[PDB]
């Protein structure tokens, strides 16, 4: 069902789109994963630290 | 021995983002001037934002104000994020009033000639008071890049991070343009996306004035 | 809001006292940035001094761990509200929902 | 203050002055290793990835 | 500039006594006198006088002869 | 870790791939095919090394 | 205060050789050292022009995999030495350069029988070792004038086309201060030419290319 609700959008079912690096606008040869990934800033801070 | 580019077509799709098509390039040369300009465009612009504000009724941003639906921390906040072109000089000072229950929009802003406003319907904040009134003073500054609060440095002065730039995102590409019988000359788009604060075509000029300036040090060499 | 959950955010954030929740339905009256002002229905207000009820908003007190609470109502003026909604929003709440 | 002169004679005297690095527990001889320092920005302490 | 004391520590018998003679020499270049017989390139004093082991031209025999020399004043 | 990735994915041959079997003159010049994409980071070919 | 920018104050240029030089530079904007490396070397690689080597006729052999006795270079070692002779052309698109040699010993660039426009870079470069007196080798070599790299596949034996004069490209960017702002980029560049042309002159002629490229829009 998660390859299902992918397919009702308009993106690839495999999960993995191509990318183009940004110095140099070469493709990327082996095409990657993105996503929305939850996360959390923890309570350990430098400021705190140093 | 090579072409000479030059722009053809600026295809309007909304007041916001727009697509630019240039002359047909030897190849080769699509990928190299494509993410140079990406590159320029999305790192150094001019832009129109806002650094700092004055309310009346207020001594701190993280305080409250009484007939306001929401903070104060949060209408900075949202009016952060606020679009604004000036033509005459270098910074202005803008200034609004209101009163009574409803939305507060940024056409209740002042109208003097220098300031226009691209997005009118951007909503400020929101009064829930019968008699309530909300006045405050918004700087409007020039600048290019990300200029934090902090680093650039009264009590009733609130101090707002710049996100000068007016370009979010940029992208292009490369096909072979039907031009004469040569199968080797082919055309970039570039589709641009902009707050709509700046002409697309005045964008792509300064970008490549901005290159050209900057390769003048390896031809003098 | 988390994209991907489990479904008892709703009942961690509700279940905690962190969030406003209506001791008693009617129609929202006044909103402002600290205070709720909540007109109860016919049916469950007390036959005698029945009134309206009143929620006042903690707004940047400090923790025990030197962060913030906050609270920021989620409702507009004069719209209807039940028994057990949720009004203001927490700290990492959002429309009664934990969001971290 | 801060003055721009400070940090020009602080890199003069900062080139080939070695400064300890530990992390406890320093369980070998290895734990403690001397570096030549370069200044960098932030607020963390850059170390060499092998 | 220098990075590595491999090719001096080879020069003299074993890194102590490399540490304790660059120090003395170290110590003279520094707190009076003694033009170092090898240009400098903006270097410390520290380094400089290392340098100066493994050109095999400074040495506990070589540095103790020239000290006893400078004292029969 | 990220190294010997890049290591492995470097010096492992395919049985076709863009630009097989050619010959090139130097390491030089086969740095040159890579980066102008005319030749895949790995097919098998004959150089002349020293 | 809007529009000016950090134009870079100092160019070192080392010289490690006749044909290898570095070339050092700084301080650029956050981000400027990449496109200006990436764009030089885009248009280094495959956009200057330059003549070289493409179709080469030998009368003893007409295969690939073929052998010529008194040699005991291969024909394909033949052709790889073949493909770095450096060769520059005035005025003329194309040439032709015909070579005969018979007896023992090495054949050298010089050998060749060029006129006044055809001139060769390097009379040293060596072809191929003759072992044998009887050994003669006679043979006609097509130079042609082109832009980049050219493949033979993508094409009586026929020879890659190394055109552009610039052999090696690789660049780096550092971190370079100016008073207190440290995230100012410094680039330093490495190339290595075959020897028809100065190193740092190759630079300039690729800078003006691009230049050249964007006079409808300054």
């Known amino acids: 069902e998660i390859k299902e609700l992918l397919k009702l959008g308009d993106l690839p079912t495999s999960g993995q789109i191509r990318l183009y690096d940004g110095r140099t606008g070469e493709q990327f040869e082996r095409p990657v994963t993105v996503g929305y990934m939850y996360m959390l800033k923890l309570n350990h801070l430098v400021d705190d630290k140093m | ?55 009346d009724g207020v001594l701190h941003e993280y305080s409250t104000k009484e007939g306001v639906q929401e903070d104060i921390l949060e209408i900075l906040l949202n009016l952060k994020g606020l679009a604004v072109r000036v033509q005459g000089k270098d910074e202005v000072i803008l200034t609004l009033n209101k009163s009574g229950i409803g939305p507060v929009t940024a056409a209740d802003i002042t109208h003097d000639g220098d300031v226009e406003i691209v997005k009118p319907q951007h909503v400020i904040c929101h009064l829930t008071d019968e008699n309530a009134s909300i006045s405050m003073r918004i700087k409007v500054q020039r600048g290019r890049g990300y200029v934090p609060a902090s680093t650039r440095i009264p009590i009733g002065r609130l101090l707002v991070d710049a996100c000068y730039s007016p370009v979010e995102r940029i992208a292009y590409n490369v096909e072979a343009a039907r031009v004469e019988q040569r199968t080797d000359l082919d055309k970039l788009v570039i589709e641009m996306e902009t707050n709509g604060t700046i002409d697309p075509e005045e964008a792509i000029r300064r970008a490549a004035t901005i290159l050209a300036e900057q390769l003048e040090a390896f031809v003098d060499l | 809001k988390p994209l991907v959950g489990t479904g008892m955010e709703r009942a961690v954030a509700v279940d905690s006292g962190v969030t406003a929740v209506a001791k008693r339905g009617g129609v929202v009256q006044y909103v402002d940035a600290s205070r709720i002002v909540i007109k109860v229905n016919e049916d469950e207000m007390y036959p005698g001094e029945a009134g309206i009820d009143i929620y006042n908003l903690t707004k940047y007190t400090r923790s025990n761990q030197n962060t913030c609470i906050n609270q920021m109502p989620c409702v507009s003026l004069g719209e209807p509200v039940e028994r057990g909604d949720v009004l203001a929003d927490g700290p990492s709440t959002d429309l009664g929902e934990l969001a971290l | 203050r801060e003055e721009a002169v400070v940090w020009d004679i602080l890199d003069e005297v900062i080139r080939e002055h070695p400064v300890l690095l530990n992390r406890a527990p320093t369980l070998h001889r290895l734990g403690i290793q001397a570096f030549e320092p370069v200044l960098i920005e932030g607020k963390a302490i850059q170390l060499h990835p092998l | 500039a220098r990075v590595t004391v491999q090719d001096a520590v080879e020069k003299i018998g074993n890194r102590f006594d490399l540490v304790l003679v660059a120090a003395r020499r170290a110590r003279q ?7 170092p017989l090898v240009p400098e390139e903006n270097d410390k004093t520290t380094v400089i006088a290392l340098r100066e082991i493994e050109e095999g031209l400074i040495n506990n025999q070589i540095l103790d002869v020239r000290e006893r020399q400078e004292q029969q004043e | 870790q990220d190294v010997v990735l890049g290591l492995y994915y470097m010096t492992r041959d395919c049985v076709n791939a863009k630009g097989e079997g050619m010959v090139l003159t130097g390491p030089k010049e086969a740095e040159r095919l890579y980066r102008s994409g005319l030749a895949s980071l790995h097919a098998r070919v004959k150089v002349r090394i020293t």
């Open chain 5, 29 to 35: 270049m520094q707190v009076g006198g003694k033009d």
């Open chain 2, 1 to 55: 021995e090579f072409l000479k580019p030059r722009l053809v077509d600026i295809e309007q799709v909304s007041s916001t983002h727009a697509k630019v098509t240039l002359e047909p390039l030897e190849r080769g040369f699509g990928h190299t001037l494509g993410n140079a300009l990406r590159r320029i465009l999305l790192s150094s612009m001019p832009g129109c934002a806002v650094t700092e504000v004055e309310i």
